[PDB]
Symmetry: D3
Subunit: 236 residues, 6 copies
Amino acid sequence: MATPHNSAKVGDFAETVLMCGDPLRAKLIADNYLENAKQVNSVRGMLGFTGTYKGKPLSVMGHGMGIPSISIYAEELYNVYKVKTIIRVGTCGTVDPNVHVRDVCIVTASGTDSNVNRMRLLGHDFPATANFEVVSALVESAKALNIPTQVGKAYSTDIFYSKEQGLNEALAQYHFIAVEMESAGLFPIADYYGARAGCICTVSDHIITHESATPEERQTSFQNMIKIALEATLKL
Amino acid sequence: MATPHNSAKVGDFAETVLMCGDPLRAKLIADNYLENAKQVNSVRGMLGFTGTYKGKPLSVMGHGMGIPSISIYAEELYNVYKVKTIIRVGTCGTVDPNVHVRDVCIVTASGTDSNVNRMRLLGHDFPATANFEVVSALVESAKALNIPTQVGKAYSTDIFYSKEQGLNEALAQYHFIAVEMESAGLFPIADYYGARAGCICTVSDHIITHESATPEERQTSFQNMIKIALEATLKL
Amino acid sequence: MATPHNSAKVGDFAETVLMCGDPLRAKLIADNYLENAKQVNSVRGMLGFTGTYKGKPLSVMGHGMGIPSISIYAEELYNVYKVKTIIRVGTCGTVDPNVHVRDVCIVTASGTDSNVNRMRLLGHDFPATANFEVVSALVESAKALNIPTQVGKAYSTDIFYSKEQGLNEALAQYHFIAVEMESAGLFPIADYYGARAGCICTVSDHIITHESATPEERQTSFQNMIKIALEATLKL
Amino acid sequence: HHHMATPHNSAKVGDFAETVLMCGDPLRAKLIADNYLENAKQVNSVRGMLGFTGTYKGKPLSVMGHGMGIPSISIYAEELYNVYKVKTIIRVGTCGTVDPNVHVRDVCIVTASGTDSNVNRMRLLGHDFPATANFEVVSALVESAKALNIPTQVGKAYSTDIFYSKEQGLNEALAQYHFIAVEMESAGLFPIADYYGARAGCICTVSDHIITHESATPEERQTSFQNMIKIALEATLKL
Amino acid sequence: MATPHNSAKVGDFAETVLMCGDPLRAKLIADNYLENAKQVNSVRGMLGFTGTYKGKPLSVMGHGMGIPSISIYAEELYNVYKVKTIIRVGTCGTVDPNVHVRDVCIVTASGTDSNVNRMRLLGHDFPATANFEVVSALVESAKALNIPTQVGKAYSTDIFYSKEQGLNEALAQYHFIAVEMESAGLFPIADYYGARAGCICTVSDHIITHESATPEERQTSFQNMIKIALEATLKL
Amino acid sequence: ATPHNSAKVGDFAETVLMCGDPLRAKLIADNYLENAKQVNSVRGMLGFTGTYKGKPLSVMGHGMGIPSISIYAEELYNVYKVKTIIRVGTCGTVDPNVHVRDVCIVTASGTDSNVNRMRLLGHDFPATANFEVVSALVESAKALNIPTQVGKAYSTDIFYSKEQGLNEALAQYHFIAVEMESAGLFPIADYYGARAGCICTVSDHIITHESATPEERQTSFQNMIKIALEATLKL
């Protein structure tokens, strides 16, 4: 196989890839938004697909949960499959007092409690930073669709089941808008390969005040986010 | 759903669960070694099954790749599903000069480059340590099956595609026998819940000498490892 | 005095402030580009001025050298003086193989070897991240002026006279475009106050290949950069 | 050293058996030799760190003090494995516990030990290196206790550099993760055994419950010591 | 120019230099205590002067605020200007229960929350330690002038506007006598060049009790401190 | 009155010399203290109290390493109400201008231990000798016409160092002494509002591999102990 974790042949992925944690959501995106989609990977159930969106080649693939998982898949996509742009699409929590469930968050950079970026920069602070053209394309696509967005920092944690006192309050004080588990691992890999990455997420829960989007609101948020991402690919 | 990542209801998992990263390997284990088997989870494609091995209830489920992924699944199994014992089964690399591809490694403790255990113990060194009853059951099962084993430390990394100079040589100097991605995250979660965990792996590659197991060797080693793990469950 | 380091009264600063390390350069900006400018601070020689640019209120003030120095001045400006936006303007080195002397660098986020941001976020990785509106206004201003720009990460070091082996090569591998000493301290303070910050710098030296801008190239680069920043304030 | 085999040990090469019991107090090493070893001879006196070599039930065995703390045991154990060609060290001592199901007088067999020392990070490029006991040693201690009908607790220790701790929240975190023994040396011993391809373990008796403040009486400590040392000595016959 | 930050020619600085953060205080020292004084640096407003005290050449110059700033100026003074001794003079807070506002503190070593010294000593603890001949010369000068002094540790912070719970109480418990922002960066640079440094400060504020020196007390303490420093230079 | 010391408060003088080897503690008491009484032998860690030229003085072993000295010193300051501890010992050096037989008076000590970060919220806490003690040692050496080196020590947890680049960095920043305990002593003295210092003689040059002979070690020890004893008179 071309990699230990992907049965796709070189060339089977488009230069632009959307990725989400849940492979079954990758399949939903392919089935509902890609034309002439073909499954190109099923190793470990991590479904990946390639088709077109409005005539332009586009792939979508799951990345699993957490920094180590996305790091495997993204490293391979840039190195082996010669992908140029990855947009991560997902859901997130928020702690920011002026961000609400159903909001769409476009990530400019992501903090983390992982050690992976310190290990790349001699132990120093290496900001996991989205590519500006990708950020701008997402922002401009949402404007054209008349969909309000929040633009700012995410925080990528290794621990879904946090026991850490004071973390949420510190994230809120510094206006982190999205809490998720992967973006801080993706951005430095794109940098290593001289490539591009970004992230867009919908807010499912307010971590501080405990609001939670209903199933119907989650479907609407998902449709808005995915249309923003798809339209942005046409400008990238 | 009982958790965001698992559609099983409390009671659907046995008290002992084998887990491996690849959900398709979890399915292979269920199909080839469990009787009375039923599928109990398919959220995110992370297949899980419950059946019997030699009459005793046993579950087997995928955990995905990396510490953050296994942490989600294992926290839930212990907390929500009331599981008492998780045995991780998988493949690994080795750096040890006296360990060879095809070998079976029983893990007594695992080091890591993750921050998750420092965060649990006020920044200090918290050894991710296998439960002694579990280690002993694996060791004694292998002896009873006439299968030689290596017993000793693993190292769980967040980065499959390592760029770290000197790491392999240090691991070799201190006789780490297995390099994998998850066990250091599992053992402290078992500790938190007053429960039990262990790990057994097959050596697919020698990271120093670059030897690699043939497909035939990987089948042999899998058959040895899984029989040891299954027989151990009868003693637990 | 309103603060220990600033004799200005509350209200003496405009809501938007350009800052540079050298107070004599702050004076040069006030003298050559601001209308009806008045000096509002001279404590510690850290000259600050308020006037208008194309009739819009604007202030300019020195910040001194290094994170601790800018942290004092910026904390006071946001907290006591109720400043809404700070744009840092300066010079930088580069290590990136495709960035050259005289290039204009617009900073999206900055790494650092300082501890100040770990101390704000429970020891974790807190990306010092520029405000997107500010970044965009700088990018669009440069486009209108027909000045090419590089957009991406800076690195803010505490040590001008670096002795650190391997740092430059790692910065280059991950495409850090600017090496300076202050931006990583500014952005988190802006966050704390729910305010905005950014940074634009011109490349005076290639740290790896050793090209250095002449005095005349330095003046031309400064003229380009300051016009970009001033025009950006009209959009903010 | 000018004439000694190491700077801290006057024993000649070969004066130590391949299996060595070690405890912090050199006077306890002497008590162990006097009361349990036959054919015994003192082989070290440097720094008062008494060490002895004889036999236990016919098999060669040594016992020597290691002093207090990771740096001290590191000196002695590095020398034992490197210069004296020792194959197995079993640390014997006392400990505190924070675990809610461990009580004073319990015997703890250590599978691995955490620490607040930097010595293991320095061995593994700054990463987490678990100080891990050798499984054959752990198993021999467990099986020896079973044969003597002495109950044991088996699990993690924590080795601290600071006896007089002022650290808030530490005991509660150790209890939450079921650390069974708090002492000062095991985390330094196990990685040195690894470096030399050799074996190490640890067994300790609980003198104090750090949470509930229960404390063993002197007579309970004597019984606990006798049980522990019998377990360790019998384990050496299987190693 | 001889360096990027100093317009003095080599030789224009005496072998001993007093430095303080505020360049206007450097000018005050020159105006009131040096004879034959001339200004030798004006770059960045960081005024420096050279004259004589009781016939012996002596320089005084500002160093700005924080470790990065003093590091630039001191590295240059030792390396380019061939200075042999730098005595930092300034103001400080105190946390010590036996130290009071108005007191003069002679610094033997300084702690820090900066990373600059870990980076010099392989990540380890490197005490920023004053040169004994300098400490002794200050102590003996004070004794000869019949001025009592406090002698002991300082703490050099990167963050003037501290938000750090428990810091002041730990500093008080261990009898740190002075809190300031620069000494910990100066002493290791002196070590690197085989040169000498020390620090003497006046207590302006008690951080624990909140007492503050009156203007008259600040004048008395300044007069004491500067006379101690000047007399010490005659013995160095 | 402690788990490691059978003495009771008042059994130690207010000033205590300490060295790693308890047998060297006994040598110091036997050869330099008048009217000396043994006040501890728990764990073999001999301690003694007598007088030097009329002034009460004690001498006791501290064992090897920061954890060991921390136990003994914490107890001395807390239970035994000691006011001044002077550590006396041997050291290595990496400094190009320090040689075997040199006497090193320590002003501060670096370390690879975590004990000081844990006392100061993770930050850099310099283990710093008390100035009156440093000065007393320097002046006593001057009075005896013995040259001294005055400067930084480095206290390591690992005698058998495998660390590449360490010696070269210590040399570049002119650390004059390498040993194993002083960085643990000075912060404990700070905690109790008390005084500590350290003096050591160079037995080995770690870079040049020069090593002191038996005769040279005797001369060096006699020089150092006389400096420390005479310093106690001024403290």
